[PDB]
Scaffold this motif. Structure first.
Motif, PDB file in Angstrom:
ATOM      1  N   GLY A  33      26.902  42.578  36.038  1.00  0.00           N
ATOM      2  CA  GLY A  33      28.017  41.634  36.033  1.00  0.00           C
ATOM      3  C   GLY A  33      29.427  42.159  35.651  1.00  0.00           C
ATOM      4  O   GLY A  33      29.297  42.892  34.540  1.00  0.00           O
ATOM      5  N   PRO A  34      30.291  42.165  36.550  1.00  0.00           N
ATOM      6  CA  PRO A  34      31.713  42.514  36.582  1.00  0.00           C
ATOM      7  C   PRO A  34      32.458  41.894  35.304  1.00  0.00           C
ATOM      8  O   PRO A  34      32.869  42.435  34.211  1.00  0.00           O
ATOM      9  CB  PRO A  34      32.253  42.532  37.595  1.00  0.00           C
ATOM     10  N   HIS A  87      35.266  40.811  35.279  1.00  0.00           N
ATOM     11  CA  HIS A  87      36.799  41.303  35.196  1.00  0.00           C
ATOM     12  C   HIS A  87      37.421  40.996  36.589  1.00  0.00           C
ATOM     13  O   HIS A  87      37.269  39.992  37.079  1.00  0.00           O
ATOM     14  CB  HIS A  87      36.615  42.925  34.858  1.00  0.00           C
ATOM     15  N   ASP A  88      38.157  42.207  37.069  1.00  0.00           N
ATOM     16  CA  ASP A  88      38.885  41.871  38.164  1.00  0.00           C
ATOM     17  C   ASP A  88      38.037  41.902  39.468  1.00  0.00           C
ATOM     18  O   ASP A  88      38.617  41.704  40.589  1.00  0.00           O
ATOM     19  CB  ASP A  88      40.050  43.176  38.285  1.00  0.00           C
ATOM     20  N   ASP A  89      36.476  42.281  39.336  1.00  0.00           N
ATOM     21  CA  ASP A  89      35.833  42.106  40.509  1.00  0.00           C
ATOM     22  C   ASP A  89      35.620  40.735  40.835  1.00  0.00           C
ATOM     23  O   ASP A  89      35.688  39.774  39.784  1.00  0.00           O
ATOM     24  CB  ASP A  89      34.610  43.074  40.152  1.00  0.00           C
ATOM     25  N   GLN A 133      35.923  48.384  34.226  1.00  0.00           N
ATOM     26  CA  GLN A 133      35.953  46.930  34.797  1.00  0.00           C
ATOM     27  C   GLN A 133      35.077  46.816  35.918  1.00  0.00           C
ATOM     28  O   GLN A 133      35.176  45.497  36.516  1.00  0.00           O
ATOM     29  CB  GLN A 133      37.307  46.376  34.824  1.00  0.00           C
ATOM     30  N   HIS A 134      34.564  47.807  36.307  1.00  0.00           N
ATOM     31  CA  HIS A 134      33.817  47.830  37.645  1.00  0.00           C
ATOM     32  C   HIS A 134      32.220  48.127  37.484  1.00  0.00           C
ATOM     33  O   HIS A 134      31.789  48.817  36.443  1.00  0.00           O
ATOM     34  CB  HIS A 134      34.248  48.854  38.590  1.00  0.00           C
ATOM     35  N   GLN A 135      31.448  47.591  38.235  1.00  0.00           N
ATOM     36  CA  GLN A 135      29.942  47.805  38.197  1.00  0.00           C
ATOM     37  C   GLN A 135      29.332  48.565  39.529  1.00  0.00           C
ATOM     38  O   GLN A 135      28.457  49.338  39.279  1.00  0.00           O
ATOM     39  CB  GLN A 135      29.114  46.518  38.003  1.00  0.00           C
TER      40      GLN A 135
END
Lengths: 709, 641, 69, 254
Positions: free
Chosen positions: A131-132, A134-136, B273-275
């Motif tokens: 799970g991001p 955030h900005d995603d 902040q990225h997956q």
């Protein structure tokens, strides 16, 4: 910890490549082949799900969240033991769906021995690191398939989407809370010639739809929609998709194009606008022999009203009488520049004039320019601006920019104009739209040679990008009457969709400077509409026709830059304190990505410092680069031969000492010199120098934002 | 740096590195006339850099230079064949003094002299290290570059003239020859190599050259992965490792792949902040990102393509156990060094009798007298006839009055085919030409290994000790699948509520026994479980909570500080989620298995079991016995998902 | 005691040609003179025995640091 | 973390406090020699009078016979923007020469060559000043000189709404704590380069001083060589030995 149990059962369905619910064209059907596709069923596998019309050959769209369990139940009914290979993390080799030499225990293949008629439940889940938050976007899609034979586990229709969204703002099904729609996309190439039933049917069927017979996506306005950028091809095949008019927001970034490969895990969302009939331009040059077109049907259902203000909030307007004059003239323009520098003998002494008795001197290459008054015969100067050549000049947009393209054709074919991703007025077209309604909301871009038409529309604050990206976004414009032939005729430019840095009537680019672009379009004379002005009409050798020979073919296959096929007249020798914005573009008849290697030079993008970059067609790539270097090197590529041996660049970058303006020639100034009066960087004004805007004599209303609050 | 013309073999899968099939005859020639690089520690020849265990990813490619800030390594070159060679780097804004590209210049014989190296003649040349390759923003710390020849942009990348320029940051360095490491980074170069498209083209082919090799389409242009085909070694990590992987592609401009790991989610650093999850590749740049493992096993490494998998790369990476510190041949009585081979011994003391702290003044390893020991060849072939994985070996001397008697230095070797002795263990990651040793006699000394060394013919060899060569090397291996981990039947994680005892012995006018300490090496009253009765009716049930895969077992036994009793045979009763006290079924037939308990007094019992024991309430009923019932039951299960 | 012209551990690296970067391991101006580099401070400072750093002479010229406390 | 530490009573001479005839200061200066004192132009323009005293570590108190450096008249600057801030450098024309004492230490003159080697190496710096740029509620009686790092140029044009040119750049911490308007206006941001000391920054207020934790504004005198050279040789030799040395010059600093 939510239980997302599904019941999928693959079966062979003789699905036609065209949605024909009427039995009138079944006797002479041009498509009648079987397809082994995924199909969802009820618990215990009773009745088959009806499935959406968009999912022609696509299986069920699985959805899940973070930290949840997915006890998916599968029942193969094809002919061979298939499997399901997702993209999770918690699944082990016992239930992975991959049949290969694992060098482990033979009991781990029980997930692959799903006989046609045998049920098997896969015990899967997902961890919390998916799970991001955030900005995603709140969703992270995945692709599950069969690891048996990718040549067959795709062309038959064994493809299915898997969604692992975020627990919280998501409902049951994959739809968000603030968004009321869930749009799932799929673009595939079902190569029937290489599958289970070896039948010669090499056809580009997007989800089993040919000639644009894909069901149109429709949704009324006054609501929110959510997209899901998915669609795997047969391999290294891409899809140059674009959302005309309506602009999406991929990764919380307002974009209107997405072109990757192998179905990249990416979803997006946006907010609809006014009613109309927009376009989903699936312009794939390498994939057009079959047909792949789509549109947008935006109606109007009054449900909720947002606080979207039309003009800017009481500070920015800049209402000016500046309409861009464009006249589709036929001035004498050739592949070689006016008096070439490096001597382009391949085109100068062969096709530029009466040499070799081929074409001639008088051509009909139409170019989109920009005049300064209502004359339609001379722009700012008599020739061109040199720095663009046949390419479009410098055009900037802002609030109330009055983008009134006074287009008056005067050649031999009705042309028009269309900026990439711009919303217009119901009265004027300026977009390849099929929306033909009443006289009030009619839009026709057909501008016959001799007739004039002005596309009037007010670009305001609802036409600007985000805040984190660059200032002016690159959006290359081209003719909307034709798709692929007008681009080869020199009818392409670039538009600057800038942010909220509107200072005066022109918009002072704060913390910026000039602009340096780079275009490399490989086209042919047979692709352009003026093929008749080459070997048949404009010809002086009827006894010997330059056709059916490799000499005349490669003479037209050329890569141009700023209208200069050999080499450009300008160099990339910048200096210090050059906060310019480099732009790159490379359109043509290709579909994959194009790259270029830089030796001894680099750029700045993504808060880092990379060496080489990779552009994309259709849309325009923009990047703010500061050119700081001392010396000279080559900028060659690494490919085959016609695009790696002559695609170099010769320039010298020197800064002695600051911006190198004390003993050389450059359009900059450090200054750092004897300043006994007035020079550069001398902003001394009697009233007030500068700050944020110029709404009044001192600006008394204090609310300068960067979009809708 | 050198470039001797050595014919390299692309179709390397015939070497049987990790292949299964045997009918893989090559139609053309296995080897191809190419050029391989080499690293030298001096300017002249006759002195090469031994390729250590960490220097694995290279194949046809030569070494990898590691130059950072305030650290420069010379690269003297001398041509050996008859063609002038070149060398061109990429990345920084290097001038033509260290560029080496064939184009316009200024200096006569300096900017382009390195492109024309005369045979049998050295040349002064050295590159410059910058700070541009350092990845900014809090996240990464390494970003590799590339370098190759320059006499031809295409005829050189296929001639085996490639090389990656791995450059990190400055601030975190290790003591491995003053090279910044402190991690476990990897680098892979995926690019096909063609023989017909090279300078060393011998005008003809090895079979046919009519329609681009009539045997196979571009047979000379094989998709060699990392210089070889169907190889990719060194992919032996442990559970949960955030190691950095460097993906470099410069030649493959028309080959786009998407890397997808079977059950391993991705995590991008920098922005934090990225997956993502999946991560493709673009031609030109040098993409690098972490891995973050999850579950052990032979997980396949593929790129989801049809032309570069079954005919390109198809090597599954293995994840072994991390906490595999169980006894192997010291505390047990089954696994021993009876299959030891050597040539020269050290004295007259007993060979196998080398246990830690044993009675008697004769406890070492020898068969024949030592006479004189020096830098000869007293090699000790420690063969196991199976796969091995050692991360640490202890060393202890001997004494009996006052003397120290300890080995100060000994070199280690290894082999994988017996016919050849690859004496190269002494030059691993940290070691270069030495190895640790024992210090005293009453202090135990250990030698921990950094790289996961894998072999089969281990070879150790001493040098000279304190006027008495005596060595007592122990044995410490690890698992192969990566899941057989002790659940705590002997450590303390498994409480008494799961493993329960039967009857509790209690005397009338005295004390009472506590037979609930059924663990390994226990103190107090008793040491394990000793029931009151002595027949084939007592039980020793264990609660496994969830299903497990049990392969290895162990059993010692307890006593009462007087007589030693044990169990000679028992039966394992398997079950499921519910309750079923049924013995474990025999997979080779249809009946039940008859297990054997402790053989002797204190020697443990070690046995492997291929069929899993999917159960939760495993019951052990001792059939036969010795004197009384006694056993230190402890198994090794797995985490079946 | 290896021969001259070769420096390093086992005398491998040659002599330094230019300074350019890192100020040439000298605490003043680095300016190459075609394979010949020499550092020297101006007024207020002198030189050492080899040229590693200029030895302080004056009490307080135009740039010093007080380490009395 | 090194906080706002006060200046030492040894190696901290660059502090020519520019006060008035009454008990009220305004800004400060920079000590380099005996004929020119670098400071901001708004110190005198659109302000009050001018009274300088070198070697004055405290305004309320006095450390004996040390603060003496009176100024006769003063001029302005050509590139000095009255509304905003740009090349805000002014020279104080003293009236009495002062020798080199302990609290009065000279410094070598800068040059254009120390512009590409001082900003890439010394990424820090110190800001000497009594505290008169932000004279709101932090008026410390002790001479404070904190340490501030250097940031990239691409993060200085957005620190304030005014577009900053090349003469001034970042010279502070990130958007965390109070690192702007430190010390007195015209305060020397001298960076210890190598065996010498060259000032390279002047703190000035842009739109005043409020919640400015982003970045700071400090000039660069390496480009100011053409102004300190035109106002030193064209004035001629000292007539009455620093009268005016020499205040009799045009307003745009010659």
């Amino acid at each position: 910890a939510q239980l997302r149990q599904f019941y999928v059962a693959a079966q062979g369905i003789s699905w036609s490549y065209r949605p024909e619910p009427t039995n009138s064209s079944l006797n002479l059907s041009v498509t009648s082949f079987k397809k082994i596709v995924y199909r969802e069923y009820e618990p215990y596998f009773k009745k088959e799900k009806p499935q959406s019309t968009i999912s022609g050959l696509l299986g069920p769209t699985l959805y899940a969240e973070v930290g949840d369990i997915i006890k998916v139940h599968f029942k193969n009914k094809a002919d061979k033991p298939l499997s399901i290979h997702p993209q999770g993390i918690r699944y082990s080799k016992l239930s992975e769906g991959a049949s290969y030499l694992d060098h482990t225990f033979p009991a781990e293949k029980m997930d692959d021995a799903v006989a046609p008629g045998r049920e098997y439940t896969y015990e899967w889940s997902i961890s919390e690191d998916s799970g991001p938050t955030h900005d995603d976007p709140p969703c992270l899609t995945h692709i599950y398939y069969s690891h048996e034979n990718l040549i067959e586990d795709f062309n038959s229709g064994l493809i299915g989407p898997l969604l692992i969204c975020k627990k919280g703002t998501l409902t049951e099904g994959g739809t968000q809370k603030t968004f009321d729609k869930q749009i799932v996309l799929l673009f595939a190439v079902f190569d029937e010639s290489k599958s289970w039933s070896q039948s010669s049917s090499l056809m580009y069927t997007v989800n089993g739809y040919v000639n644009g017979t894909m069901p149109d996506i429709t949704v009324c306005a006054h609501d929110h929609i959510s997209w899901h950028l998915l669609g795997m091809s047969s391999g290294p095949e891409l899809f140059s998709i674009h959302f005309n008019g309506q602009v999406l927001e991929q990764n919380h970034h307002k974009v209107s194009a997405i072109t990757l490969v192998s179905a990249t895990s990416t979803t997006a969302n946006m907010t609809v606008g006014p009613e109309g009939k927009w376009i989903i331009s699936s312009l794939t040059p390498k994939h057009l022999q079959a047909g792949m077109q789509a549109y947008i049907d935006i109606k109007n259902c009054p449900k909720k009203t947002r606080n979207l203000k039309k003009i800017t909030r009481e500070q920015r307007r800049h209402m000016k009488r500046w309409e861009y004059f464009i006249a589709a003239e036929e001035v004498i323009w050739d592949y070689a520049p006016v008096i070439p520098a490096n001597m382009d003998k391949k085109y100068r002494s062969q096709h530029l004039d009466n040499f070799s008795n081929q074409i001639g001197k008088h051509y009909k290459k139409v170019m989109y320019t920009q005049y300064e008054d209502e004359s339609f015969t001379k722009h700012t100067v008599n020739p061109n601006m040199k720095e663009d050549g046949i390419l479009g000049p410098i055009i900037r947009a802002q609030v109330r920019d009055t983008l009134k393209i006074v287009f008056k054709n005067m050649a031999s074919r009705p042309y028009s104009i269309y900026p990439h991703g711009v919303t217009f007025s119901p009265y004027e077209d300026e977009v390849n739209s099929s929306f033909t309604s009443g006289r009030n909301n009619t839009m026709i871009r057909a501008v016959q040679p001799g007739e004039t038409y002005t596309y009037k529309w007010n670009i305001l604050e609802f036409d600007e990008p985000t805040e984190n990206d660059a200032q002016c976004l690159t959006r290359p414009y081209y003719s909307d009457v034709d798709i692929m032939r007008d681009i080869a005729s020199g009818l392409i430019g670039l538009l600057l969709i800038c942010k909220s840095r509107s200072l005066d009537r022109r918009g002072i680019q704060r913390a910026a400077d000039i602009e340096q672009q780079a275009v490399f379009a490989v086209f042919d004379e047979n692709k352009s509409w003026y093929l008749e002005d080459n070997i048949n009409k404009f010809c002086e050798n009827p006894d010997e026709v330059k056709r059916d020979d490799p000499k005349f073919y490669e003479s037209n296959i050329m890569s141009t830059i700023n209208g200069y096929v050999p080499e450009s007249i300008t160099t990339l020798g910048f200096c210090f304190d050059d906060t310019v914005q480099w732009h790159f573009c490379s359109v043509g008849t290709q579909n994959e990505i194009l790259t270029i290697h830089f030796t001894g030079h680099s750029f700045i993008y993504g808060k880092r410092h990379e060496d080489t970059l990779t552009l994309f067609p259709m849309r325009g790539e923009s990047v703010t680069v500061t050119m700081d270097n001392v010396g000279t090197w080559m900028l060659t590529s690494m490919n085959s031969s016609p695009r790696s041996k002559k695609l170099r660049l010769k320039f010298r970058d020197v800064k002695c000492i600051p911006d190198d303006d004390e003993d050389s020639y450059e359009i900059f100034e450090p200054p750092e010199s004897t300043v006994m009066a007035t020079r550069k960087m001398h902003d001394r004004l009697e009233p007030e120098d500068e700050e944020s805007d110029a709404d009044y004599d001192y600006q008394n209303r204090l609310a300068a934002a960067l979009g809708i609050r | 740096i050198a470039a001797e013309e050595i014919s390299w073999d692309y179709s390397e899968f015939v070497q049987r590195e990790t292949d299964i099939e045997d009918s893989d005859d090559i139609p053309e020639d296995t080897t191809y006339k190419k050029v391989v690089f080499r690293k030298y520690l001096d300017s002249t020849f006759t002195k090469r850099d031994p390729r250590g265990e960490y220097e694995e990813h290279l194949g046809i490619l030569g070494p990898i230079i590691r130059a950072e800030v305030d650290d420069v390594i010379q690269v003297r070159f001398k041509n050996l064949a008859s063609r002038p060679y070149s060398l061109h780097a990429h990345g920084l804004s290097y001038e033509k003094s260290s560029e080496g590209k064939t184009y316009e210049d200024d200096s006569p014989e300096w900017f382009k002299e390195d492109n024309a190296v005369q045979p049998n003649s050295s040349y002064t040349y050295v590159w410059h290290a910058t700070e541009r390759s350092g990845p900014e923003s809090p996240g990464s710390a390494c970003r590799a570059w590339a370098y190759y020849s320059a006499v031809n942009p295409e005829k050189d990348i296929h001639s085996g003239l490639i090389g990656p320029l791995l450059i990190c940051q400055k601030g975190i360095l290790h003591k491995d020859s003053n090279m910044p490491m402190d991690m476990r980074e990897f680098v892979l170069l995926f690019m096909t190599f063609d023989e017909k498209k090279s300078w060393y083209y011998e005008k003809k082919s090895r079979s046919s050259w009519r329609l681009t090799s009539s045997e196979m389409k571009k047979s000379h242009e094989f998709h060699a992965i990392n210089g070889m085909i169907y190889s990719l070694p060194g992919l032996k990590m442990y559970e949960q490792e955030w190691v950095r992987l460097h993906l470099l592609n410069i030649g493959g401009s028309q080959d786009i792949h998407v890397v997808h790991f079977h059950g391993q989610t991705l995590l991008e650093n920098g922005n934090k902040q990225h997956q993502l999850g999946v991560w493709p590749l673009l031609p030109g740049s040098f993409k690098t990102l972490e891995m973050k493992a999850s579950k052990p096993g032979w997980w396949l490494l593929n790129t989801e393509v049809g032309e570069n998998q079954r005919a390109g790369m198809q090597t599954p990476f293995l994840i072994m156990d991390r906490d595999c510190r169980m006894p192997m041949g010291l505390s047990t009585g089954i696994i021993s060094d009876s299959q030891i081979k050597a040539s020269e011994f050290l004295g007259y003391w007993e060979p196998r009798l080398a246990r830690l702290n044993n009675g008697g003044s004769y406890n070492a390893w020898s068969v024949e007298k030592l006479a004189a020991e020096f830098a000869s060849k007293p090699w000790i072939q420690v063969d196991m006839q199976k796969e091995v994985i050692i991360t640490g070996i202890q060393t202890q001397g001997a004494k009996h009055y006052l003397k120290s008697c300890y080995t100060t230095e000994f070199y280690v070797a290894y082999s994988s085919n017996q016919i050849n002795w690859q004496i190269f263990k002494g030059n691993s990651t940290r070691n270069v030409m030495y190895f640790n040793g024992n210090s005293d006699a009453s202090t135990i000394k250990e030698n921990q290994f950094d790289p996961p060394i894998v072999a089969r013919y281990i070879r150790i060899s001493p040098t000279r000790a304190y006027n008495r060569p005596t060595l007592r090397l122990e044995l410490q291996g690890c698992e192969v699948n990566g899941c057989s981990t002790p659940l705590g039947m002997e450590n303390g994680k498994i409480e008494n509520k799961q493993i329960t005892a039967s009857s509790f012995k209690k005397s009338w006018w005295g004390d009472y026994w506590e037979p609930f300490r059924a663990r390994l090496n226990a103190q107090g009253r008793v040491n394990a479980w000793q029931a009151k009765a002595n027949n084939n009716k007592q039980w020793l049930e264990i609660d496994l909570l969830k299903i497990k895969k049990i392969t290895a077992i162990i059993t010692q036994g307890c006593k009462s500080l007087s007589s030693e009793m044990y169990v000679k045979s028992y039966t394992i009763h398997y079950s499921e989620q519910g309750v079923e006290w049924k013995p474990y079924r025999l997979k080779s037939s249809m009946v039940d298995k008859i297990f054997e308990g402790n053989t002797n007094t204190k020697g443990h019992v070690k046995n492997f079991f291929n069929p899993p024991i999917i159960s939760r309430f495993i019951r052990v009923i001792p059939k036969t016995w010795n004197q009384s019932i006694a056993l230190r039951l402890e198994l090794f299960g797995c985490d079946i998902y | 005691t290896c021969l001259e012209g070769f420096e390093g551990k086992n005398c491998e690296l040659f002599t330094r040609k230019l300074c350019s970067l890192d100020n040439g391991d000298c605490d003043q101006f680095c300016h190459e003179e075609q394979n010949s580099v020499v550092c020297s401070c101006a007024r207020g400072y002198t030189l050492a025995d080899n040229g590693k750093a200029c030895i302080p002479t004056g009490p307080y010229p135009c740039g010093k640091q007080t380490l009395e406390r | 973390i090194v906080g706002g530490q006060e200046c030492k009573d040894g190696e901290c001479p660059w502090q020519a406090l520019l006060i008035n005839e009454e008990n009220e200061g305004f800004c400060g200066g920079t000590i380099l020699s005996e004929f020119y004192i670098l400071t901001a132009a708004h110190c005198l323009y659109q302000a009050k009078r001018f009274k300088v005293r070198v070697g004055d570590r405290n305004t309320e108190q006095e450390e004996g016979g040390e603060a003496v450096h009176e100024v006769e008249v003063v001029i302005k600057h050509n590139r000095f923007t009255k509304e905003t801030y740009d090349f805000d450098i002014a020279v104080l024309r003293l009236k009495t020469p002062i020798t080199f004492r302990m609290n009065v230490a000279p410094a070598c003159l800068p040059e254009r060559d120390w512009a590409e080697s001082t900003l890439m190496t010394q990424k820090t710096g110190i800001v000497s000043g009594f505290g008169r740029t932000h004279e709101k509620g932090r008026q410390s009686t002790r001479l404070k000189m904190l340490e501030v790092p250097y940031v990239d140029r691409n993060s200085c044009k957005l620190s304030s709404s005014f577009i900053i040119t090349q003469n001034m750049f970042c010279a502070g911490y990130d958007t965390k704590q109070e690192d702007a308007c430190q010390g007195d206006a015209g305060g020397p941001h001298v960076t210890r380069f190598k065996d010498t000391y060259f000032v390279t920054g002047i703190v000035s207020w842009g739109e005043g001083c409020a919640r400015k934790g982003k970045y700071g504004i400090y000039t660069k005198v390496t480009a100011f060589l053409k102004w300190i050279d035109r106002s030193m040789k064209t004035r001629g030799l000292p007539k009455a030995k620093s009268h005016a040395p020499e205040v009799i010059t045009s307003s745009p600093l010659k």
